[PDB]
Design an enzyme around this catalytic site. Structure first.
Site, PDB file in Angstrom:
ATOM      1  N   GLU A   1       0.833  -1.198   0.000  1.00  0.00           N
ATOM      2  CA  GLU A   1       0.000   0.000   0.000  1.00  0.00           C
ATOM      3  C   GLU A   1       0.863   1.242   0.000  1.00  0.00           C
ATOM      4  OE1 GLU A   1      -0.883  -2.582   2.220  1.00  0.00           O
ATOM      5  OE2 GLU A   1      -2.866  -3.089   1.399  1.00  0.00           O
TER       6      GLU A   1
HETATM    7 NI    NI Z   1      -3.656  -5.205   5.014  1.00  0.00          NI
END
Ligand code: NI
Ligand code: NI
Lengths: 259, 259
Positions: free
Chosen positions: A45
């Site tokens: 992320e």
């Molecule tokens: Ni996660």
């Protein structure tokens, strides 16, 4: 023009824990540009923090899509805020797709308060028992499937078969757990649709904390996530059916994105 | 302590081309630490440049292993040297696992001279013809398998089946090629064991340049690699059975690794 950081969450040392990119912005940029940046970083992320008058907006993107919740990258974003943006701030509030998230800095530990979710014991069908790829002592159910193994060694030995685990459609992730050798308890978390093992998972501890709290008779515990990178999670049962999940963070790289 | 850059090779714009991490070191660091850094970056390759008295040592690491050659990350490393280390140097020499590599900066184009390798036309066996997942106009052979398709549209339309392509063990990579709409020729390069499509491949142009040079009657050509990110390659047939492969590079991020 935008400050950029690579941070390891729930890590006591560099190259451990769950890595995230953290991009701190003075102004808004298009969501399509945030996605391109997350794809370019190729980290699990990239967190985007918009610092505005009186608040922080926080979004997270995998290299493929925007997501609505990410506890481990939220810890990384709070680490960045308190170490570089608002130096030594104790309370960090983020406004996200899933509402307001609060992170508290306690020394160098970052604290997140989650709902306590005691899982329910279930019996797997003969077909489901053949998809889990192990013979657990007990089986518990919540958002994720929880498989109680007989030792930390059995947790370490497990090798996921993602094709088989993807057939267990009733659950998001597959958790294997046991008592720890050096910690109170241990776990590993598997993401069958992502074909990957999650380095450190905060939200599984919503179930693991009440479950091990009852088994061990302890309100304060330490947990390890026995992924390749590995994670350490400080666990505490709080009063109002909540749990506290805490972790350390480490800075790998500090730079700027030229956009 | 170490300067770190994310650069897009063979890219006319940010988020295009083949991305590489480039770590510039004043002193040697352990190979095990270079591997950890490459794994942390999670970029296709991280290039490590050791600047010593009179020379540059260059190594490349994927997130999993050290490799012995990488033309596209070498272009990124040369871009970093000439833009930040030895500002506007024209000739960049690197000492690597595969010997000395020279890169020439011509304006903002980075030039690499490779051996010319005219591929040989072959006939695939009925089993091999069923593994390629297309009906090509012609089939050529070298280090890689070369499939001549009937149009740029057919190159764009192709969807690799990596399980089937992995069964073509006689070749390293699978190349699909055709005449271009906006360029002289186009190609896509598939890495079956990596389960991925290479964004931009310099070494396939060792075969593609003599092949299209003969077909089109041109010594200077422009090629496109029609991957998702996409690449542009300047191509030239040189005198001594060599070819020149050139590309632009773009800086995405400049920072420091805290080790
Ligand atoms: Ni996660
Ligand atoms: Ni390559």
């Amino acid at each position: 023009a935008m400050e950029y950081y690579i941070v390891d969450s729930f890590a006591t040392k560099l190259f451990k824990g769950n890595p995230a990119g953290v991009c701190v912005l003075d102004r808004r940029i298009p969501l399509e540009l945030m996605q391109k940046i997350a794809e370019e970083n190729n980290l699990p992320e990239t967190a985007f923090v918009v610092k505005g008058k009186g608040n922080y907006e926080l979004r997270w993107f995998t290299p493929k899509a925007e997501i609505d919740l990410c506890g481990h990258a939220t810890l990384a974003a709070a680490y960045v805020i308190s170490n570089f943006i608002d130096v030594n701030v104790k309370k960090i509030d983020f406004f996200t797709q899933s509402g307001k998230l609060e992170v508290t800095r306690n020394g160098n530990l970052y604290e997140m308060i989650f709902p306590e979710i005691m899982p329910i014991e279930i019996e797997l069908s003969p077909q489901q028992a053949n998809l889990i790829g192990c013979v657990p002592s007990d089986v518990y159910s919540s958002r994720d499937l929880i498989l109680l193994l007989n030792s930390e060694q059995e947790v370490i030995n497990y090798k996921p078969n993602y094709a088989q685990l993807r057939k267990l459609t009733d659950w998001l992730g597959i958790i294997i757990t046991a008592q720890g050798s050096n910690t109170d308890f241990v776990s590993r978390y598997f993401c069958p649709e992502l074909d990957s093992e999650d380095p450190v998972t905060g939200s599984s501890h919503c179930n693991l904390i009440p479950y091990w709290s009852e088994k061990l008779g302890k309100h304060k515990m330490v947990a390890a996530q026995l992924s390749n990178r590995g994670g350490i999670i400080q666990c505490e049962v709080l009063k109002d059916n909540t749990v506290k999940i805490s972790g350390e963070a480490v800075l790998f790289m500090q730079g700027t994105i030229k956009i």
